[PDB]
Ligand binder design. Structure first.
Ligand SMILES: [Cl-]
Length: 135
């Protein structure tokens, strides 16, 4: 399991639609996100806690399997153009980071060969906190 996802109403809806795409049929991360969104804690973009990793946030995180640190911006697949700076929410690490708070760690093992162990070190940029309610 993983900690409950904290997400704003708009991204929750967009991801719900995203997961419906047949391109993601049978994918472990898609199935996992569907289940997690059903029990996610949602709120308006203005009510979003300032330390939560949200879509389009830039986050510094550590891989708990090897100690490696990286900075990546979490984006929707349509916007993923550079793997050295961006991370798809549909990729295991992106899905694992989504909804976590700075300071949280996650040890998410899913059947089908997917497992992520990460720690959120810093939230360099969060759209909600910057007023970019994207509305
Ligand atoms: Cl997957």
């Amino acid at each position: 399991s993983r900690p409950t996802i904290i997400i704003n109403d708009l991204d929750a809806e967009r991801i719900d639609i995203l997961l419906e795409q047949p391109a993601y049929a049978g994918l472990p991360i898609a199935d996992a996100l569907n289940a997690e969104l059903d029990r996610a804690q949602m709120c308006s973009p203005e009510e979003m806690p300032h330390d939560v990793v949200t879509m389009n946030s830039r986050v510094k995180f550590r891989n708990l399997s090897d100690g490696e640190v990286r900075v990546r911006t979490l984006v929707y697949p349509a916007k993923m153009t550079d793997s050295n700076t961006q991370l798809s929410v549909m990729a295991p690490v992106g899905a694992a980071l989504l909804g976590l708070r700075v300071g949280d760690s996650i040890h998410w093992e899913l059947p089908g060969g997917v497992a992520t162990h990460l720690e959120v070190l810093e939230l360099e940029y969060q759209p909600e906190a910057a007023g970019d309610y994207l509305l």
